[PDB]
């Protein structure tokens, strides 16, 4: 597609100037560019790192000589470098280790998550399946459920005293609920820190159930049975304990993992940090437990798609039909399928009747190849999302994402830790936190900082998506930019869709329009917040 990179001869012709001294900085560039070409027995990582040297060399020439006439030629040389990265990425490939990585932490894996995972097992017999759990942390979801429920009723006690709606909308409800959740959550953190200063060998679940027994009179026998049932269930479903994943545990992002797991009860974020380190150290394809295998290309491409239905409507309808007539997943929704005409419905009933094996319904992954430089990512509505990742073991980008997540957590904790150290209510702690954010905010990180200031709200307030910017897809784009701009710790993303499309995965490798993907486990929108309000009102009145 592109154009071969310029030779040592081709660059002097390009960067030629008259009355020129051939500088030591300029020769350094030619010297490095010559070596790059006779490097035909080296791996792509060594090659990539040459290009990084070349670019860093080019940049010091321009910083030292700001009026030189070669600058305008060397900048165009730089653009050739970034093109060669894509040449590196596309030609010399490596087979991807046949590992499918899932992550379910914080509580018991439900049958929907297992049913979905089994669809990946049944059609990828050659694939080692790994379902990551954290044996010390089975009670985080129970703790969160108890504290949030407690906070819903405490919030509604301040609503019964008052009338229908003087100014008591769903907006005031989630604001007041947020203040009460932050007092309870801070109380648990304070208890968690005190117990690990007393004896730091205590596991997380041991501290959670004493806290639950002491504050909510929870029967510890029923919680040890939940733990034993959750450990039993995951160990029969390809479980891999995080605690026996030593490279993660000894890593620098484990303190970040436990921050979200224990302090924030954000398991989406904890899962964001763990997934990338599992690729860096084991390699393979990571998948979210709400993602299904890809449907076979020539299937249902006999039924004409009606004009009166969205494409995205059609993609959901497919899976619904499969499950309705082939029942591979029980309790799967049928609501989009049940909204078509009887004739187009029986069209689905005919085509599916004609198939016997699940190989004839879901594509298999098979032998997959990829570049040692790249981590491939899934695309959704013209945007990257880490709900599908393919990476070669110890890929250059995989390390770049980890450092990107680590860097963002450094900025956050820098501004957050001083504020939470002062033991004040939510509103005061927010205001102190934001004061610090604005001080460290410029035009390059402003938009990222804009999102950090909501960090305490994540998973308890409507329309808060800080996790995306901290541990999620933003850090993957900033990494891809780091790769393409021979940089470390990119913040201001200058890349567009077509740039990022370099790292997509075939839409035939994942079905993304699943039932469970429509319900986010860590985020909710305004509309779903308004619903919850009338739901809580009636659940309290009963």
């Amino acid at each position: 597609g592109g154009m071969s990179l310029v030779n040592r001869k081709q660059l002097e012709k390009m960067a030629n100037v008259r009355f020129r001294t051939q500088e030591d900085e300029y020769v350094a560039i030619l010297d490095a560019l010559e070596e790059y070409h006779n490097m035909s027995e080296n791996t792509v990582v060594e090659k990539y790192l040459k290009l990084k040297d070349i670019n860093s060399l080019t940049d010091i020439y321009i910083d030292t000589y700001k009026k030189s006439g070669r600058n305008k030629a060397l900048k165009k040389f730089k653009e050739y470098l970034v093109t060669e990265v894509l040449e590196l990425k596309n030609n010399n490939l490596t087979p991807v280790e046949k590992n499918l990585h899932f992550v379910w932490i914080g509580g018991q894996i439900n049958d929907t998550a297992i049913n979905y995972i089994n669809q990946w097992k049944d059609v990828n017999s050659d694939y080692n399946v790994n379902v990551f759990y954290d044996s010390n942390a089975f009670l985080i979801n129970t703790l969160k459920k108890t504290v949030v429920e407690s906070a819903i009723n405490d919030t509604l006690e301040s609503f019964r005293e008052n009338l229908n709606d003087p100014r008591f909308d769903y907006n005031k409800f989630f604001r007041k609920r947020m203040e009460i959740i932050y007092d309870k959550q801070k109380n648990f953190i304070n208890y968690y820190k005190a117990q690990r200063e007393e004896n730091p060998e205590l596991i997380i679940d041991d501290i959670v159930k004493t806290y639950l027994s002491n504050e909510y009179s929870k029967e510890i026998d029923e919680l040890n049975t939940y733990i034993e049932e959750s450990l039993n269930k995951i160990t029969q479903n390809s479980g891999n304990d995080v605690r026996n994943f030593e490279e993660f545990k000894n890593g620098e992002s484990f303190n970040l993992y436990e921050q979200e797991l224990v302090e924030r009860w954000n398991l989406a974020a904890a899962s964001d940090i763990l997934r990338i380190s599992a690729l860096k150290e084991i390699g393979g394809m990571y998948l979210d437990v709400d993602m299904l295998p890809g449907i076979q290309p020539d299937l249902f491409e006999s039924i004409e798609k009606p004009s009166s239905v969205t494409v995205d409507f059609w993609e959901m309808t497919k899976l619904e039909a499969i499950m309705k007539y082939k029942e591979y997943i029980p309790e799967y929704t049928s609501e989009h399928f049940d909204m078509l005409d009887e004739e187009v419905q029986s069209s689905f009933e005919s085509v599916l009747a004609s198939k016997s094996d699940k190989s004839e319904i879901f594509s298999s992954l098979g032998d997959m190849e990829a570049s040692p430089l790249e981590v491939k990512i899934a695309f959704n509505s013209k945007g990257i999302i880490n709900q599908g990742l393919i990476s070669v073991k110890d890929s250059y980008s995989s390390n770049l994402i980890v450092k990107q997540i680590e860097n963002r957590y450094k900025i956050l904790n820098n501004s957050l830790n001083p504020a939470i150290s002062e033991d004040n209510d939510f509103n005061t702690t927010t205001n102190t936190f934001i004061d610090s954010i604005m001080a460290e905010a410029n035009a390059d990180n402003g938009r990222f900082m804009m999102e950090l200031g909501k960090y305490l709200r994540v998973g308890f307030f409507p329309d808060v998506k800080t996790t995306i910017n901290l541990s999620g897809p933003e850090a993957y784009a900033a990494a891809y930019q780091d790769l393409l701009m021979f940089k470390e710790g990119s913040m201001n993303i200058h890349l567009i869709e077509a740039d990022l499309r370099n790292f997509e995965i075939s839409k035939t490798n994942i079905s993304q329009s699943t039932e469970q993907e429509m319900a986010s486990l860590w985020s909710f929108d305004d509309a779903r917040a308004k619903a919850q309000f009338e739901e809580y009102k009636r659940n309290y009145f009963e």
Partner: protein, 180 residues
């Protein structure tokens, strides 16, 4: 495009800001759900045989983010000040909140006044529950006057659902960002 146009979409919660940018950049209204993706709303446009990257940024309209939101305002070339024509509180917050806020942080930056959800003008259900007060939907003539009064460049209507005036809103957004 070697030249980048920062357009920042501003306005009250639940006026159709997010759906606006999704509908425009993907040609698909997100009726089903919004996936938790890195947004990266960036359209390449050719104008007088010169390539431009149009950068679109969503914002949190709510009071709770009144101090965080302007952190994204620097380097802004054009604002879409948005209001739902079936929500006169969103329209009355254009004069009272949004136009002051952008003239405070970006005083020389032009802004389009943008009507959203126009399809819900001719919607049975939403009229009579609105008609349960003084409230009536906002006429394009009322909003064209507020545009002139507040020194907006233009008034533009659109529906993210029917994509009706949708392409025009953003066309006029680059025109604001190139005019003196």
């Amino acid at each position: 495009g070697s030249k980048l146009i920062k357009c920042v979409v501003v306005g009250d919660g639940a006026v159709g800001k997010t759906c606006l940018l999704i509908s425009y950049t993907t040609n698909k209204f997100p009726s089903e759900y919004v996936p938790n993706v890195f947004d990266n709303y960036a359209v390449t446009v050719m104008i007088g045989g010169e390539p431009y990257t149009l950068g679109l940024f969503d914002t949190a309209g709510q009071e709770d983010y009144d101090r965080l939101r302007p952190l994204s305002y620097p380097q802004t070339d054009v604002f879409l000040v948005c209001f739902s024509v079936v929500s006169p509180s969103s329209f009355e917050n254009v004069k009272e909140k949004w136009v002051p806020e952008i003239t405070h942080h970006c005083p020389k930056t032009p802004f389009l006044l943008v009507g959203t959800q126009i399809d819900l003008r001719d919607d049975p259900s939403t009229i009579e529950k609105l008609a349960k007060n003084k409230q009536k939907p906002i006429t394009p003539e009322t909003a064209e006057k507020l545009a002139r009064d507040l020194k907006a460049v233009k008034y533009v209507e659109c529906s993210a659902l029917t994509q009706k005036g949708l392409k025009n809103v953003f066309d006029e957004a680059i025109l604001a960002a190139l005019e003196p």
